[PDB]
Every structure is written in structure tokens, then in C-alpha cells.
Amino acid sequence: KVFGRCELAAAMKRHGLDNYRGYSLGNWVCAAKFESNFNTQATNRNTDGSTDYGILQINSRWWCNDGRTPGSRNLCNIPCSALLSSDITASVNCAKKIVSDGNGMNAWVAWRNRCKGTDVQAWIRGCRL
């Protein structure tokens, strides 16, 4: 599923992400835009052989099992394929574990490089939430 901007903001707001660990909703929408272009089916292979999955590009070397990332951890206890659902619940629940692990949203390279320190509230402006 390719989300609309406001559609995803509402969905994320309705999975508890607004101000989760202090990150306002716009941060999450911004990260999703640049990680996956709002596409729940996005996958990208990393040089170390891991793969990033889903609208927040959650990485198989730590967070999900895809059966092909040797010696990886599955800190979220999900198959990575669960992260490609049109239902973002699994991605959101796993993202909450990631953002809580000490490095905040800096775990998302696109967030640090394209969202951090920008006017992220612009990503939810015009949405009725």
C-alpha cells in the first residue's frame, strides 16, 4: 500500500507515535517519506547482506527475521515480511522498540539526514488529525 501523507499521519497517530519518546508526529511522517516514499512494500538490500523492510525500512540484521541474514538478531520477534503489510501495526510496534533503544530516531539514516532539524510539522500541516 502506498499511503497518502495525511492518511499515514492519522494511522501513525492512531498507533501511538505522536510524541512517542518525544518525537512529534511530523518526524515519523518525514522519516517514512524518505525511507520508503510511504510504500509499505519497500525493500532495500544493504552491503552487509541485511535488508531493510517496510515503510520505516526496519533492518533485518537486528530487528526482524528474514531467514537470510546470518547471525542476525530478531529483536522484534517478527518475520520481516510482516513489516510489508498494508496494516502498519507491526512496523509501528517495532519502531517503538527501536526508538527506545537509546539512539532515538537517529537509527533512521534518512531521518537524521533529511528530517532532523527541519520544520517537520510541515509534514502534517493540512491534515485533520
Residues of the shown chain interacting with Cl ion in the complex, contacts defined by CB under 5 A: 24-26, 104, 121
Of residues 25 and 83, the one with the C-beta less far from Cl ion: 25
Task: Give the nearest distance from C-beta 78 to Cl ion in angstroms.
Answer: 23
List all residues 6 or more positions away from 74 whose beta carbon is below 8 Å from its beta carbon: 63, 64, 65
- Cα angle vertex 26, ends 21, 32, to 5°? 95
- Residue labelled with grid coordinates 510539522: 121
- Are 45 and 25 in contact by the 8 Å Cβ rule? The answer is no
Q: Looking at 48, 52, 66, 87, which residue is catalytic?
A: 52
DSSP state of 65: B
Is 52 a catalytic site residue?
A: yes
Q: Is 48 annotated to bind ligand?
A: no
In the complex with Cl ion, the residue whose CB is nearer, 28 or 50, is 28
Name the minimum Å distance from CB 112 to Cl ion. Answer: 12
- Tell me whether residue 44 or residue 121 sits nearer to Cl ion (CB atom): 121
Q: Is 7 a catalytic residue?
A: no
H helix intervals, 1-129: 5-13, 25-36, 89-99, 109-114
Please state the residue numbers annotated as binding site for substrate.
101
Question: Which residues are part of the catalytic machinery?
Answer: 35, 52
